[PDB]
Design a protein. Structure first.
Length: 227
């Protein structure tokens, strides 16, 4: 009654003229596109993650639309991510599945993705490594901090987090902690332990993450309720 504004509390509140357009219908879409083309070449979640992040970074840096199809980009970001993450997928294999999955007004060829590849690398100044919150997660599990169930839930959140572009606003460990906290939020023993890992320097970001994560599921949970 007093404040359904908590709904608005899930929006920039300062328009798009200040600090990033994270977790938009496009963000959510793009992540999905990467997942699609990825599940085709039966690629692992780690490669998708790296690929969506390289794309996110590219978009941000990119300042002059070069008329590249989001599909072409996604295709190249997958190709590049496979080369980097040591799960190479021959240039050819990608062009095929790309076309055999996409009815593109411009068929993808060797030169096609190659120009894009350079376009990305060039713009990203060869900065292709991407760190993910997965390491943190497995670690907390390894050190016996979180049980197996918690891990899996938190791990899922992280996978889902890749439709929000939080990867451009928070360090992998911060996002990881948020996911972990959201997860073991009910276990009274786990929490204290998790709070230890979190240093005040992270505090805000972690909270920042938790917010975006929640909004993610309630911008995907309200869409279904409206239907």
């Amino acid at each position: 009654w007093a404040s359904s504004q908590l709904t608005q509390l899930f929006l920039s509140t300062d328009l798009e003229s200040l600090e990033p357009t994270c977790l938009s219908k496009d963000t959510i879409y793009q992540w999905k596109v990467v997942q699609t083309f990825g599940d085709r070449l039966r690629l692992r979640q780690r490669v998708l993650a790296t690929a969506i992040v390289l794309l996110r970074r590219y978009m941000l840096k990119k300042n002059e639309e070069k008329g590249f199809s989001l599909e072409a980009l996604v295709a190249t970001c997958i190709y590049l991510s496979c080369k980097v993450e040591e799960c190479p997928v021959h240039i050819r294999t990608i062009c095929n599945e790309a076309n055999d999955l996409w009815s593109l007004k411009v068929k993808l060829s060797r030169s096609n993705i190659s120009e894009i590849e350079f376009e990305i690398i060039s713009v990203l100044d060869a900065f292709l490594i991407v760190h993910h919150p997965y390491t943190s997660l497995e670690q907390a599990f390894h050190d016996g901090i979180i049980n197996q169930k918690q891990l899996e839930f938190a791990w899922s959140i992280v996978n889902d987090s890749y439709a929000s572009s939080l990867c451009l606003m928070a360090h992998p460990h911060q996002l990881a902690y948020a996911a972990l906290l959201i997860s073991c939020c009910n276990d009274e023993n786990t929490i204290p332990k998790l709070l230890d890992l979190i240093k005040s320097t992270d505090a805000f970001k972690v909270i920042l993450c938790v917010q975006r994560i929640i909004s993610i599921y309630y911008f995907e949970d309200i869409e279904a309720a409206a239907l």
